[PDB]
Design a protein around this ligand. Sequence first.
Ligand code: FE
Length: 52
Amino acid sequence: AKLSCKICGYIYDEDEGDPDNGISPGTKFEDLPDDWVCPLCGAPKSEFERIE
Ligand SMILES: [Fe+3]
């Protein structure tokens, strides 16, 4: 699944992960640490919303 950061143009795609910050491809959003934030703008998980 894919989730948009409400606050910038970033999209978290579970099939991409966030590898530059230590999150492997295939990591589900539910499994991101509670201290994970958007790699571009620092918004928390509460500021992401599922998109198609
Ligand atoms: Fe962002």
